[PDB]
Amino acid sequence: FNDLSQLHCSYESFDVESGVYSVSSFEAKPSGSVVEQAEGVECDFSPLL
Amino acid sequence: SIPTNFSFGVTQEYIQTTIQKVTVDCKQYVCNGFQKCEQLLREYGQFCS
Ligand SMILES: *[C@@H]1O[C@H](CO)[C@@H](O)[C@H](O)[C@H]1NC(C)=O
């Protein structure tokens, strides 16, 4: 549910000790994707035209 | 045997009184935020605790 939930389940009790604790971190979401390393060739239609 | 000349000798020493405090997140370090990993971590559980 929250950081205190993780802290409570870390100590396996409803009561814990007062202090400073390290809870699991979080990550900024990726803004998108980029795909640029190799591009293909184009089909030829000049003999058609 | 009595001295006649003297010097003020310096002497340096160091005491490692305090190693560097560290903390570590369990699931972020081991698991890298991919949901099947967290599903496969809950059985081990209290190792992080
Ligand atoms: C005592 O030692 C100092 C430094 O080594 C030197 O300059 C001085 O001449 C000495 N004196 C005597 C009496 O040996």
From TrEMBL, chain A:
Gene behind this protein: S
Parent-protein residues present: 341 to 389 of 1353
Functional summary from the UniProt entry: Spike protein S1: attaches the virion to the cell membrane by interacting with host receptor, initiating the infection.
Similarity field: Belongs to the betacoronaviruses spike protein family.
Domain remarks: Fusion peptide 1 (FP1) and fusion peptide 2 (FP2) function cooperatively and have a membrane-ordering effect on lipid headgroups and shallow hydrophobic regions of target bilayers. They are considered as two domains of an extended, bipartite FP. The membrane-ordering activity is calcium-dependent and also dependent on correct folding, which is maintained by an internal disulfide bond in FP2.
Localization of this protein: Virion membrane; Host endoplasmic reticulum-Golgi intermediate compartment membrane; Host cell membrane
Lineage start: Viruses, Riboviria, Orthornavirae, Pisuviricota, Pisoniviricetes
Entry protein name: Spike glycoprotein
Quaternary structure and interacting proteins, as annotated: Homotrimer; each monomer consists of a S1 and a S2 subunit. The resulting peplomers protrude from the virus surface as spikes.
Post-translational modification: Specific enzymatic cleavages in vivo yield mature proteins. The precursor is processed into S1 and S2 by host cell furin or another cellular protease to yield the mature S1 and S2 proteins. Additionally, a second cleavage leads to the release of a fusion peptide after viral attachment to host cell receptor. The cytoplasmic Cys-rich domain is palmitoylated. Spike glycoprotein is digested within host endosomes.
